[PDB]
Design a protein around this ligand. Structure first.
Ligand SMILES: *[B]([O])([O])C1=[C]C2=C([C]=[C]C([C][N])=[C]2)S1
Length: 267
């Protein structure tokens, strides 16, 4: 019955906001807690930056990368929304960890593209999804074109259920060392771009960390984890709402946060 409320309340938002909403919540093992259009494909947008940081941390864990390695670049690497990358441009480099932190916490596009260059590009990000058991998520392009979200285009897509299970595998499923898992959790909680999204719809004692995405054509997404009353959850929310303003798209994702919260409190 709380499941029907969840479904009805999301359908109400979809209808009233002219939006498509895809949600999946899974427990630490990836078992479904709730879902809504959970297997519809949505553009990842900047949400992939969290799995990208996980890939980088695993390479550091494995001794094939080091967090202090300096990555050289020029003005050619500055694309739209590259605030850290632009600050570090005169110095000529960012370290692997500086780039990862800017990618995760500021959504910096140039820092993300720097890491894609070092790992061998989109194909390598896709191979990491496959390695961790995700047969759906795919990165095809670098930023910002991967955020085009052209209707019908399956490049650069995931599904809510695949990405929620990828989050659960990274945080609870032993993809990373204990150290690296704790760090990436800490980075997600300290994300600077999510204050108006899912977090704005959750209780203030839940421990939440997330990565936002914004795409052209009205996409607004948020994926991450929350700890609610001694239970851990992974969540992925993908929305498309081309007729909403940017503020209204944040509000929609906060409202999906509140519908999630009502389901969780019911169980
Ligand atoms: B992320 O993939 O969600 C983003 C892509 C862009 C962001 C900000 C600005 C631009 C402009 N090209 C793209 S966030």
């Amino acid at each position: 019955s709380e499941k029907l409320t969840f479904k009805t309340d999301l359908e109400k938002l979809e209808r009233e906001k002219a939006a498509q909403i895809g949600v999946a919540i899974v427990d630490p093992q990836g078992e479904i807690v709730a879902g809504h259009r959970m297997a519809q494909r949505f553009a990842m947008c900047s949400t992939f930056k969290f799995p990208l940081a996980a890939l980088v941390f695993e390479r550091i864990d494995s001794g094939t990368e080091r967090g202090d390695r300096k990555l050289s670049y020029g003005p050619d690497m500055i694309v739209e929304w590259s605030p850290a990358t632009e600050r570090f441009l005169a110095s000529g480099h960012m370290t692997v960890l500086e780039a990862a932190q800017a990618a995760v916490q500021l959504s910096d596009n140039g820092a993300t593209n720097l890491l894609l260059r070092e790992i061998g590009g989109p194909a390598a990000m896709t191979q990491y999804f496959r390695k961790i058991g995700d047969s759906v998520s795919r990165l095809d392009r670098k930023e910002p074109e991967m955020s085009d979200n052209t209707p019908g285009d399956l490049r650069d897509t995931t599904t809510p259920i695949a990405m929620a299970r990828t989050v659960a595998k990274v945080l609870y499923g032993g993809a990373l060392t204990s150290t690296s898992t704790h760090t990436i959790e800490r980075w997600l909680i300290g994300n600077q771009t999510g204050d108006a999204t899912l977090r704005a719809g959750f209780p203030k004692d839940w421990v939440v960390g997330e990565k936002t995405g914004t795409c052209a054509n009205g996409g607004r997404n948020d994926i991450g984890f929350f700890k609610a009353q001694e239970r851990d959850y992974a969540v992925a929310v993908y929305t498309t709402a081309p007729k909403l303003s940017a503020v209204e798209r944040d509000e929609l994702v906060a409202s999906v946060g509140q519908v999630i919260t009502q389901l969780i409190l019911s169980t």
